[PDB]
UniProtKB/Swiss-Prot annotation:
The chain holds residues 724 to 808 of 952 of the full protein. Plays a role in embryo pre-implantation development. The gene is Rbm19. It comes from the Eukaryota. Disruption phenotype: Arrests embryonic development prior to implantation. Embryos at 3.5 dpc lack the mature, tripartite nucleoli, but instead, contain spheres resembling nucleolar precursor body (NPB), indicating arrest of nucleologenesis. Belongs to the RRM MRD1 family. This is Probable RNA-binding protein 19. Residues 8-87 form the RRM domain. Expressed in the crypts of Lieberkuhn of the intestine (at protein level). It is found in: Nucleus, Nucleolus; Nucleus, Nucleoplasm; Cytoplasm; Chromosome.
Length: 98
């Protein structure tokens, strides 16, 4: 019984994709409060995405819109998975090699 929260979880983020571009695409809906993509220090030591990130908005609404509004958008030839951050259901990340 509570509607209204900030934050957005993204998946399938092309390693090539950057924070700048992400802000632009999301900047269409409204003013972004804070954007941070899951990036770690690799062998080289460069901040590279991990295929997912977290976008924040100034108001719950904006996030509620950009959620699906941005969903389906063909980015880098691949579609991203947008979800309402802070969701009870945990993301099931399957393996790749095998």
């Amino acid at each position: 019984g509570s509607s209204g929260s900030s934050g957005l979880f993204i998946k399938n983020l092309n390693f090539s994709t950057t924070e700048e571009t992400l802000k632009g695409v999301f900047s269409k809906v409204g003013a972004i409060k804070s954007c941070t993509i899951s990036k770690k220090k690799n062998k080289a030591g460069v901040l590279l995405s991990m295929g997912f990130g977290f976008v924040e908005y100034k108001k719950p609404e904006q996030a509620q819109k950009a959620l699906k509004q941005l969903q389906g958008h063909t980015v880098d030839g691949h579609k991203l998975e947008v979800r309402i951050s802070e969701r009870a259901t945990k993301p099931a990340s399957g393996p790749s090699s095998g």
